[PDB]
Write a protein that binds this ligand. Structure first.
Ligand SMILES: [Zn+2]
Ligand SMILES: [Zn+2]
Ligand SMILES: [Zn+2]
Ligand SMILES: [Zn+2]
Lengths: 378, 378
């Protein structure tokens, strides 16, 4: 149906130069290096095609908040990230009271079924008040197996990931309850010790919520959660590489520690992504200054990013310390393959049978086109 | 000349079970697996043979202080550690005034030539006063190329390693000066930033002085010296795994990051090693030794260890999280191969032509015999 060629094709596992894809219907039919098996329909130029970006932890964008759980706000959040190459999105909810939580899950679950987003992430309410950040600590509470059951029932299988503070009473049981329901259990926003975090991993936690942020630091006597999470090969750690949340040497250090398959790039994007500076909302209030740097109003407590996956992809390539081609392969694993795997999402690899989600990047790695389900979004 | 057998022989690169070595005079002639090519002279039973331990950073033992620079105190420190398998020793000097420094270097340089010790390590005086520990901060000073030249001349090539605080004025010049003299430049006792430590590494520093101790901690925005040192493959980091200085998960974490060849086990042993408790007055400082645990009398700042390489080898094996055989193989690289390589000392590997330094361990991995220069010390 459509046969595309390009000077660089990243499949998830290989680097094709030049490369070509047969996309036909809604699947990738074939991929290979060299000249295509037939005449091409669209011959791209000096561009790099990568698989669609898979953002597994974001709160909104383009002025829209996923926490609003309305068709209009989700569409405008979805519109921005999709325009920038994020072909899969897991919508994150911050801490909230029991009633609103149920309303938000039900409202978003419809938009998953509708296809705008691919899943729900519960960041809160079961977090630590000492590591709140952009959350309202007063509403945080111990994970109660009754409410957990109600939320997944309300989601009809749409809750994909829940962040848990392993030091709250009943946290290890709640992790077991979540993992038995097929939900990913993540550790974050926690003052848990190394020992308490290691316990959560054995209970079934497999993801680290934005490593080093709202997280006990590494100390020579108390390693904290970050060491437990990077230690265990079952865990995929998140990192915000927007240039603000953690130093590039930290990103480099963790990649060194966990290897190519065990780190997921996320944006933690707030509603200001793609807009201008100004005062915004999340649950409390944010002020956005600098280059879209948001802090909870007058605290220097950083409240998410204003970055897109395109930007974190660019910074990962630039700051990972590898040459460009090796950097592209690493960043594609970290921004596409690994996060979808960690959350049991459809393999982002560009291989025969996979859904045709791909992004076209120019030499400077800016997005020039985006395909999802075999149709051009841009 | 002498043909020894034992059920397990680790050479540095292989695990032989059972194994045999042919020793003639002070060299290893040959090594192999299985039954020996002739009848053995010493048939070791259910023991494990390891290469001699290479302690590249220690301050004394058995009541003796290397800082004393006297035949009697050096003899008693060397005798104890040598009895426990440390067949190669670099004597470390704590911070001291210019006059005292010259006397001590000359005194130790004599004992290098005599064969008691194999080199001198200058830990201080060119360090930061904010991370002194068991040092007298008043005496620390900026590295002056005149005094540095005088110290190496006095040592006649026996000074093997100098710890440098990369944040002191003239630190990057001093590092270049040391490496041009064939001296190892180590980073330690420092508030350097990631950027300042990275500069020192590029200037020729190749060792990190007891990582995480007397060292700026890792922070998400200011990574500090430990990441710079672990990031760069030219650096071998020392670590004290005596159970007191750093948590085993940190040892495990760093090994994960830098790999099997880039960490050196050290003791940092003080004069109370092998003795009883009391107050020991090391480095013109009262040191209270409580239950092996020696800390600067008063504070909770630990002032070195009371461990031997046998003990740090044992704890590394137990806490590295690997299966027994792999733990033995890893620990031998960290306790024998890596430290001798980092300081350009004779390869501790047990291979044809190498000097016959070996250690006999029983089932609990305690030292039962020690060979040096092909002769049994115990
Ligand atoms: Zn968060
Ligand atoms: Zn978040
Ligand atoms: Zn020290
Ligand atoms: Zn020392």
């Amino acid at each position: 149906h459509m046969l595309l060629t390009a000077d660089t094709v990243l499949t998830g596992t290989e680097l094709l130069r030049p490369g070509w894809l047969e996309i036909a219907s809604d699947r990738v039919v074939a991929v290979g290096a060299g000249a295509p098996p037939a005449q091409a329909d669209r011959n791209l130029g000096a561009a790099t095609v990568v698989p669609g970006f898979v953002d597994t932890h974001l709160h909104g964008g383009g002025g829209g908040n996923f926490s609003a759980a309305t068709d209009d706000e989700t569409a405008r959040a979805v519109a921005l990230h999709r325009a920038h190459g994020s072909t899969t999105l897991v919508a994150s909810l911050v801490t909230a009271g029991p009633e609103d939580l149920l309303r938000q899950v039900s409202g978003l679950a419809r938009q998953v079924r509708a296809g705008l987003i691919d899943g729900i992430h519960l960041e809160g309410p079961w977090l630590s008040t000492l590591r709140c950040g952009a959350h309202q600590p007063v509403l945080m509470r111990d994970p109660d197996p009754g409410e957990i059951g109600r939320v997944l029932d309300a989601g009809e299988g749409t809750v994909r990931m829940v962040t848990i503070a392993p030091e709250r009473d009943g946290a290890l049981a709640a992790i077991a309850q979540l993992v038995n329901a097929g939900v990913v259990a993540a550790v974050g926003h926690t003052e848990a010790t190394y020992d308490q975090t290691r316990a959560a991993i054995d209970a079934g936690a497999t993801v680290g919520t934005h490593l080093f942020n709202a997280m006990r630091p590494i100390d020579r006597r108390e390693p904290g959660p970050a060491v437990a999470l990077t230690e265990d090969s079952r865990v995929t750690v998140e990192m915000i590489v927007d240039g603000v949340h953690v130093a590039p040497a930290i990103y480099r250090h963790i990649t060194q520690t966990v290897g190519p398959e065990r780190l997921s790039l996320i944006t933690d994007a707030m509603a200001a992504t793609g807009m201008s500076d100004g005062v915004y909302r999340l649950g409390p209030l944010d002020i956005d200054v600098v280059a879209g740097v948001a802090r909870v109003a007058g605290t220097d407590t950083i409240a998410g990013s204003t970055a897109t996956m395109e930007q974190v992809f660019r910074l990962a390539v630039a700051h990972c310390g590898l040459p460009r081609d090796d950097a592209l392969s690493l960043a594609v694993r970290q921004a596409c393959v690994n996060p979808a795997r960690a959350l049991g999402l459809p393999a982002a690899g560009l291989a025969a049978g996979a859904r045709a989600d791909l992004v076209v990047l120019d030499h400077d790695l800016a997005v020039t086109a985006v395909m999802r389900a075999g149709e051009w979004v841009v």
